Ligand binder design. Sequence first.
Ligand SMILES: C[C@H]1CC[C@H](NC(=O)[C@H]2CCCO2)CC1
Length: 330
Amino acid sequence: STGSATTTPIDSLDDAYITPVQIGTPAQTLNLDFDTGSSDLWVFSSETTASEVDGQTIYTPSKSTTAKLLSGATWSISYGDGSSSSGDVYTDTVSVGGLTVTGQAVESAKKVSSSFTEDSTIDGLLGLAFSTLNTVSPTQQKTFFDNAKASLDSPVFTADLGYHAPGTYNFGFIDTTAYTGSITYTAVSTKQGFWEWTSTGYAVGSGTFKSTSIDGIADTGTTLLYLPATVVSAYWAQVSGAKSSSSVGGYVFPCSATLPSFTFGVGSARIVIPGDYIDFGPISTGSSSCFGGIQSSAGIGINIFGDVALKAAFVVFNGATTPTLGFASK
Ligand SMILES: C[C@H]1CC[C@H](NC(=O)[C@H]2CCCO2)CC1
């Protein structure tokens, strides 16, 4: 089997991407944030504290003839951005782009933190990291991909995120029309539960490539590119007037600037992030200070190849017995 679904930016800045997902019988379609940096499929629901729901579409398990309470199971998750959610668990039928999993754990939120409430466009998350990170207790649950994997034509999924445009998540096949040149594959460590890999270096604009190992995670659920402070300083030094602002919470730059590109290495291959992809717009409405899309990972504890990097590539998440990651230009 295979599946193919379009993923759409939630706003004009590509702050996140939402993908429609069918849950239950008859189908209830919710728009979920596919997150390769976590491993829970959770949704706003009829069980979510009423004051914490503000415009989201909810899953109502009592209206699904295939929903079953997973007795005694609870979940609770906290993300790197400080947000959180928790609740109980149902199993139900879940379909993405024509690919169906029966008996998928659907984690129903009883509580969500304010950032979730305040984002009316995201109805929940669909985790695509390794199932070892799943938070369900006392019986850990599998991700949608892990459940689907044995049925797929090939044990892979791909992320093809757009810049200020829709893109595609495919399951079970590689669309050879969706990228240019060849796909370069690179090793993955699953020791922390992430799609963790080592970039071979970077360049800023038309500058020379610096060969240096940068360990980080491929994370579709993180907006920006978080890299070591040395790398990030070298980038922003090429933008007149750019500075790190403790009050704003990272590097800002004059909105009048033209940003240089940023290149990252994948083995001997190179992925170029155009300068425009690094512009996250005014820090506040009407401001001439703009927020940068490349930020320091110092204090996070891990480097994160988030959407800013991933959207510049066609990315293969290879879930073979020994997982790997592939990157192609597009
Ligand atoms: C238990 C699991 C729960 C999900 C966590 N994911 C994250 O915080 C994301 C945001 C940035 C890095 O990846 C990782 C631990």
